[PDB]
Write a protein that binds this DNA or RNA. Structure first.
Ligand SMILES: Nc1ncnc2c1ncn2[C@@H]1O[C@H](COP(=O)(O)OP(=O)(O)NP(=O)(O)O)[C@@H](O)[C@H]1O
Ligand SMILES: Nc1ncnc2c1ncn2[C@@H]1O[C@H](COP(=O)(O)OP(=O)(O)NP(=O)(O)O)[C@@H](O)[C@H]1O
Ligand SMILES: Nc1ncnc2c1ncn2[C@@H]1O[C@H](COP(=O)(O)OP(=O)(O)NP(=O)(O)O)[C@@H](O)[C@H]1O
Ligand SMILES: Nc1ncnc2c1ncn2[C@@H]1O[C@H](COP(=O)(O)OP(=O)(O)NP(=O)(O)O)[C@@H](O)[C@H]1O
Ligand SMILES: [Zn+2]
Ligand SMILES: [Zn+2]
Lengths: 634, 634
DNA sequence: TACTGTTACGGCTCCATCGATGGAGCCGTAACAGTA
DNA sequence: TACTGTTACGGCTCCATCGATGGAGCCGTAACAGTA
C-alpha cells in the first residue's frame, strides 16, 4: 500500500520521512537542486536494485553490477522497479531503431521459430525496412496457422505491445532501419521510453526522471495518456517533472525544497494539486496558483525594419520554405517535436552566422542563401546536447574562470620569487598536484561485485595540493580555499577584478550562488549543469549587435529558474541584442515578441511554416497546435 | 505479513489456496509425491525469480535464464527469495571447498586490496591450505591498520560470517584446499548450505528442500539452531522436511496430502504441531501422535554363530579398527556424519564381497583381510548416489521390465509374420519410433530468454510410435497402452508371467502403484526416484544366503514409506537373508537386531568403534550420541 | 540347457564451471588571426 | 598593443554494446562365464 521511507540522508536530504502511495500517479516537484533525483533514483531505485541483486549468485552479481548502498535506514513495501535515467544516452552510428527498441531481436526469434524464410509473405529485410505504422498494421493482420500461433504467442504479443506504444506516443513515421544517432531529442526520448516502458508489467514500480525532454504539449499529452493506461494495469508511477501538465494530471504530489543545494533537501508540501496550491511555503504551489508568475508584456516590441531572410531552406525534412527572422526583438521558434526547427536553426542559421562572423569551418545545411547577415557582428549559440561529466571538471574550470584565477595566483610575489607558473596551481597538471592521489583529492576503490568504497587521501587531506603549492597565498587565501568558496563568496572576493567578476556575476545571475567553485562535474545535477552551460555561453562579451541562439534551455529548470532566465534574456534584448530561442515551454513562448511556427506534424509530414507573427496573431490560427495551446493561456 | 497463494495448479496441485506467514519457521510435510516441492520450489520460488527477472534488461535475462511460468493465479506478499534445490550436485575434481563456498574469491579480493603480499604475517597459500577452525581463529584476530579496516570491512565481515557458519554446522576439521569431489554426503550437503545461507540477509525468503540429507541427529540439531539464528534476523524460512525434529522445532506446519501422485496435491491439515497431531485426516499427525508407528520388536534375533570379521580396516579416516558383522540378522551401521561408516562398508565390505562372489573387478579399500566370506553366495548393494534423470528413461526401462515387455511383444504372431524384433518396440531405437519427434512424444521448443513452450507432436499424437508399430497388439493392447497403464494395472495384466510379475510386484511393494510405466525420469520426484532405485535393486533373485547393503535408503521417504521399507527388509531377513543398512533415521535403527557405532566425531576425529551390540546395549553407552538419542526413544 | 552376474561399446541427455573496445566530451597548452 | 574569436594536439574520463566444454549417468546391444 505504501513505500514508506524513513531516515533518508543521501546527498543533501536532511533526514526526511516520506510515504509514497502504491498504484497511483505520484509526482516529485521542486526547484533545480532540491534533491528529487537523489530521493527517487539514488535511494528507492538503488535500494530495490540492491535488494533484488543480493539474492543472486556471485557470478550474476559480477555480471550485472551492484550500485551504491543508499544512506537510508527504513524502506518497506518495495517492489521490482524499472527506472529511466534523466541523463541522455549517446548511441553509436551502428545502432538502429529496431536494435535499440529490441524489436529486431523479437523479429529474429519469430523468423527463426516460424519461418519456412518468409512470414505472411514477407522476409526479414522487407519488414526491417518498413515504417512503424505499416509494420504494426502488417503484424496485426497475420494469418499464421494454429500451431505457429501457439509456438510464438509471446513474441507476437510483445511485438504488438511495443508497436502499439510506439504508435500511441506519436512515432509512426519512422522506419525500423533508421539509425538511432540521427534522431531529434524528442524522438530519441520517445525511443528510450519505448525501450523500457513499452511492454508493461503488473505490480512493478516505474520510476521516470523527466520523461518529457524535448517534447511538445501534444506529445506530452499523448505520453501522459499512455502512462495513465500503463498505470491502470496495476503499477506505481513515480515521475520527477517540472511541467504543469504532469502536475495537474496526477493523484499525489510530493514537493521538496524549500530551496536548492544546502538550503533544500527537505519536504515542504504534500497532497493533491489544490493542497499544493493552498500551501504558502511551497514555491511550486505559489507558481501554480499564479501568486508568482512570468509576466506577459502588454506591449510587444515591433521589428525595426531589419530582417533576416532564409530563402530555399530544405535541410533534412524542410520542404523548401522561406522564413523571416526579425532583428532586435525576442523570437521563439516553436513546433511539434520532429517538425524541423532545430534542423533549420542550428543547421543553417547558426552554421552560416558562425562561418560569416567568427571565421568558423563548419559546413551548413542545404539552403539557397541568407539575406541580412551584414546586420550582425557575432553569434553565440547553446546546443541541445548535454554537457560531458568528468571528475577533472568543476564550474570554475568550465566557465573559463580557472584560467584567470591561476594567472593571478601565479602573478603573486611569492610565485614570482619561487619561479612558478599557472600550471602548478591546477590539479590536472603534474608538479603542483598531490602525486599520491593524482589531484583527485579523494580515492575511489572499486571491487569486482561489492559496492565501491570512497576513502579520502591522507597525504593531501582532500586539498588536492602539496605543501609547496599551498604555501603561497593571495590576499590571505590559498588556491584550495579559493576553490572551496561558493559563487557568492567569489563575487564578494573578486570585486576589484572585472575579468573574473563578470563571469562570477554571470554564474550568480542564473541562481548558482550556493555552488562551490570546485564541486565535481559528475556530482552536479542536470539543472545545475544546464545552468552552468548557460552561464558559460552568456558570460561572453556582447557588442550590442549579436545573435543569441538557444536550443531548449528549459531542460531541467523549474518555473523560478526559467523566470530568471527569461528576465536575463529580456534584459539582454533590451540592451540592443536579438535573441532566437527554440522553445517548448509555454511560459517562455508567451513572452516572445515574434513566433515562427513549424509543422503541422513531425518527420516527413512537417517542415512548413504553419504560423508566423506575434503570439496574439498566432493564437488565431486553428491549424497549428501552438496557437490552440496559446489561446487558453491568453 | 503473508505470502498468500491462490489458484495453484502446477503439476498435481488440485487448485488449493495456502496462506504462509512471514518471518517464521514454516514446514511443509506430506507423503512422497504429495506435491511439496512443486508447491514451494516450482511455484513460489519460480514466481519470485520470474518477477525479479522481468524487471531486468534483455541482455541480463539472456545471461541469467528465466524459469518456467508457474500455473498460479494469485501470489501476493512475495520477496526476493534464495532457494536450495533438493537434487544433489556433482562437483568436478578441480573444485575445492573454498572455491565452492566462494571464500577463495573473498580471500583473493582481500589480498589484492590489502596485501603489501602477506596479511597478518601470512600469504595466500598458507591460509588456503589451512583448517576451517584455525582459519576462523586467525581471521578473528587480525590486527590490520584503520585504513585497511575501512577499505576491506565488507570482505572481512563476509569471511567471518561464512567461517562462523561453517564452524557452527561442524566443519572445523576440513581444509579450504580439500577437493569438493572427495567429501561425504553430509559434509557436501553442509557445504552446499553454507554456499547460500552462509552470509544471512534481512527481509529475504529462504526456501530449503530437505536440507538434512545424510545428517545425524546432532548435526541436524546444530543446523536447526543455525536456521533459528538466521530466522531471528528477520527472514522467512520454508523447509520441506520428513524429519520429526524439524517438525517439532517450527512455528507453523502446512501438511499436504492425503496421499501421493494423482491422489494427493491438496491441503489436509494446518497449524502447529499439536493441531497437526489432533487432526485425524493427517497421516503425518497420525504418525507423530503414535497412532501409527514402526513397531519395535520385543524380542531381537541373536546371531547364529556365523560372523563376518573385518580385520585391519584403515580406509580413509579409519584408525585400524576391527568390526564384527553378525550374519542372519538385521544390522544397522550408525554414527555421526563423516565418522567413516560409508568408507568402511561401501569401500571394503561390498567391494570385497562383489569381487569374491560376483567376479567384479573393483579394487577395495585399505584393509588386511575379511573372514567369513565363504558363508555368503551373492551381494546386492544400493549406493548413496542419486539416480540420473533423462527423458529417455522411465521406471519400466529402469527396473529391467522393458526388456521383457519388448521380448513378449516381439514374440507375438503378428510380429513374427511381419519380421519384427524387440528393437522396433522401443522409442529409443530407429525403426519403430516416430521419426518426426525422435520418440520423445512431446516437443520442447527453447527460446533465448523467454520461457520454453511445450507443444505435443501431431504425427504420433504423443504415442511415440508410428502406425506400423501400433498395428500389432498383444492381448488386445498395443505397446503405447502397455506403457500408459499404472503399476497396479501391469500387476493385474501380467499375472501369468512370473518374470514380469516379480518386478512389478517389487515396484508395487514400495508404494508406486500409481506410477505409470512410461512416466519420464526427469518428471519423477526425489522420493519416487529413490523408491524406483530400491525396487530395481530389490527385484533381483535371492538365493537365501545373500548380503544386502543399503546406503541411506531413507532419502526422500516419509514415515509411511520407511515403515513399508522396514517391513520389506524384515520379511527379507526372516526369509533367511542378512541385511546391513547404513542409517541415520531412528525409526529404522530402533528395529535393528545389531548396531555397530562409529565415532565419536567426524573427519580426522572419528573412525573408532564407540559401541557395538543390540540397541538396548548401545543405549547404555554415554560416550556415543547414538546411545543418548536411543535412550529417549526406548 | 537356460537364467543371472560381469565386461565392453556406441549414442543421447543433464549439469557444473569459467569485460574489452570504440566513440565522444573535457582540460591544459600552444598557435594564428580580427578588432577596439 | 591587448582582448577575444578560431584552429590543432596530447592526456584523462565516461558510456554504449555484443555460451562453450568436460564429466557423469542411462539405454540398447553384444559377448562371456558361473550355477541350478
Ligand atoms: N541526419 C538526418 N538524416 C535524416 N533525417 C534526419 C536527420 N537528423 C534528423 N532527421 C529528421 O529530421 C526531422 C526533424 O528533426 P530536427 O529538426 O533535427 O529536430 P526538431 O524538429 O527540432 N525536434 P526536437 O529537437 O525534439 O524539438 C525528424 O523527423 C528527424 O528524424
Ligand atoms: N555527493 C554530493 N554531496 C553533496 N551534495 C551533492 C552531491 N551530489 C549532488 N549534490 C547536490 O545535491 C542537490 C540535489 O541533487 P539532485 O538530487 O541530483 O538534484 P535534483 O533536485 O533532482 N535537480 P534536477 O535534476 O535538475 O531537477 C544538488 O544541489 C547537488 O549539487
Ligand atoms: N577420497 C577421500 N580422501 C580423503 N578423505 C576422504 C575421502 N573420501 C572421504 N573422505 C573423508 O573420510 C571421512 C568419512 O567419510 P565417509 O566415510 O565416506 O562418509 P560417512 O562417514 O558415511 N558420512 P555420511 O555419508 O554423511 O554419513 C570424512 O571426513 C570424509 O571427508
Ligand atoms: N509434469 C508432471 N505432470 C504431472 N504430475 C507430475 C509431473 N511431474 C511430477 N508429477 C508428480 O507430482 C507429484 C508431486 O511431485 P513433487 O512435488 O516433485 O513431489 P514431492 O511431494 O515433493 N515428493 P518428495 O520430494 O519425494 O518429498 C509426484 O507424484 C510426481 O510424480
Ligand atoms: Zn593526496
Ligand atoms: Zn511424432
Amino acid at each position: 500500500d505504501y513505500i514508506v521511507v524513513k531516515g533518508a540522508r543521501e546527498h543533501n536530504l536532511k533526514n526526511i520521512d516520506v510515504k509514497i502511495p502504491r498504484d497511483k500517479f505520484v509526482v516529485i516537484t521542486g526547484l533545480s537542486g532540491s534533491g528529487k533525483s537523489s530521493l527517487a533514483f539514488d535511494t528507492i531505485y538503488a535500494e530495490g536494485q540492491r535488494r533484488y541483486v543480493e539474492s543472486l549468485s556471485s557470478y550474476a552479481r559480477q555480471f550485472l553490477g551492484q550500485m551504491e548502498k543508499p544512506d537510508v535506514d527504513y524502506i518497506d513495501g518495495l517492489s521490482p522497479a524499472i527506472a529511466i535515467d534523466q541523463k541522455t544516452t549517446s548511441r553509436n552510428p551502428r545502432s538502429t531503431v529496431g536494435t535499440v527498441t529490441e524489436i529486431y531481436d523479437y523479429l529474429r526469434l519469430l523468423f527463426a521459430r516460424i519461418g519456412t524464410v518468409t512470414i505472411g509473405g514477407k522476409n526479414i529485410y522487407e519488414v526491417c525496412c518498413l515504417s512503424i505504422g505499416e509494420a504494426k498494421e502488417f503484424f496485426a493482420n497475420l494469418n499464421l496457422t494454429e500451431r505457429q500461433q501457439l509456438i510464438a504467442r509471446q513474441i507476437l504479443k510483445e511485438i504488438n505491445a511495443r508497436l502499439g506504444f510506439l504508435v500511441d506516443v506519436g512515432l509512426d513515421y519512422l522506419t525500423l532501419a533508421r539509425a538511432a544517432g540521427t534522431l531529434s531529442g524528442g524522438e530519441a526520448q520517445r525511443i528510450r521510453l519505448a525501450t523500457q516502458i513499452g511492454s508493461g508489467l503488473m505490480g512493478v514500480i516505474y520510476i521516470l526522471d523527466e520523461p518529457s525532454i524535448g517534447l511538445h504539449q501534444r506529445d506530452n499529452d499523448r505520453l501522459l495518456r499512455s502512462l495513465k493506461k500503463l498505470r491502470d494495469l496495476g503499477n506505481t508511477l513515480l515521475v520527477v517533472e517540472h511541467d504543469e501538465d504532469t502536475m495537474y494530471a496526477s493523484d499525489y504530489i510530493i514537493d521538496l525544497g524549500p530551496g536548492a543545494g544546502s538550503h533544500g533537501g527537505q519536504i515542504v508540501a504534500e497532497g493533491t494539486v489544490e493542497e499544493i496550491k493552498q500551501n504558502p511555503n511551497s514555491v511550486t504551489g505559489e507558481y501554480l496558483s499564479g501568486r508568482k508568475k512570468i509576466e506577459v508584456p502588454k506591449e510587444r516590441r515591433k521589428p525595426n525594419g531589419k530582417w533576416l531572410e532564409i530563402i530555399g531552406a530544405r535541410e533534412n525534412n524542410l520542404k523548401n520554405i522561406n522564413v523571416r527572422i526579425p532583428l532586435g526583438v525576442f523570437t521563439c521558434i516553436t513546433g511539434v517535436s520532429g517538425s524541423g526547427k532545430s534542423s533549420l536553426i542550428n543547421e543553417i542559421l547558426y552554421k552560416r552566422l558562425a562561418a560569416e562572423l567568427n571565421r568558423a569551418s563548419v559546413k551548413p545545411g542545404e539552403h539557397d542563401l541568407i539575406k541580412g547577415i551584414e546586420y550582425l557582428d557575432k553569434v553565440i549559440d547553446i546546443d541541445q546536447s548535454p554537457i560531458g561529466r568528468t571528475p577533472r571538471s568543476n564550474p570554475a574550470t568550465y566557465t573559463g574562470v580557472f584560467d584567470f584565477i591561476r594567472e593571478i595566483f601565479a602573478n603573486t610575489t611569492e610565485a614570482k620569487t619561487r619561479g612558478y607558473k599557472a600550471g602548478r596551481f591546477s590539479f590536472n597538471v603534474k608538479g603542483g598536484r598531490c602525486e599520491a592521489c593524482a589531484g583527485d583529492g579523494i580515492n575511489k576503490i572499486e571491487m569486482h561485485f561489492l559496492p565501491d568504497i570512497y576513502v579520502p587521501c591522507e597525504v593531501c587531506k582532500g586539498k588536492r595540493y602539496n605543501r609547496e603549492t599551498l604555501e603561497v597565498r593571495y590576499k590571505g587565501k590559498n588556491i584550495a580555499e579559493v576553490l572551496d568558496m561558493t559563487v557568492e563568496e567569489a563575487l564578494e572576493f573578486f570585486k576589484n577584478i572585472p575579468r573574473i567578476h563578470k563571469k562570477i556575476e554571470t554564474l550568480y545571475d542564473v541562481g548558482l550562488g550556493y555552488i562551490k567553485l570546485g564541486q565535481s562535474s559528475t556530482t552536479l545535477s542536470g539543472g545545475e549543469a544546464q545552468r552552468v552551460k548557460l552561464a558559460t555561453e552568456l558570460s561572453r562579451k556582447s557588442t550590442g549587435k549579436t545573435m543569441y541562439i538557444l536550443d531548449e534551455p528549459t531542460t531541467g529548470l523549474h518555473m523560478a529558474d526559467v523566470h530568471r532566465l527569461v528576465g536575463i534574456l529580456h534584459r539582454l534584448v533590451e540592451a540592443g541584442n536579438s535573441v532566437v530561442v527554440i522553445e517548448h515551454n509555454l511560459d517562455v513562448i508567451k513572452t516572445a515578441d515574434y513566433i515562427i511556427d513549424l509543422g503541422p506534424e513531425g518527420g516527413s509530414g512537417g517542415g512548413l511554416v504553419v504560423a508566423e507573427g506575434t503570439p496574439e496573431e498566432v493564437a488565431k490560427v486553428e491549424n497549428s497546435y501552438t496557437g490552440q495551446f496559446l489561446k487558453k493561456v491568453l
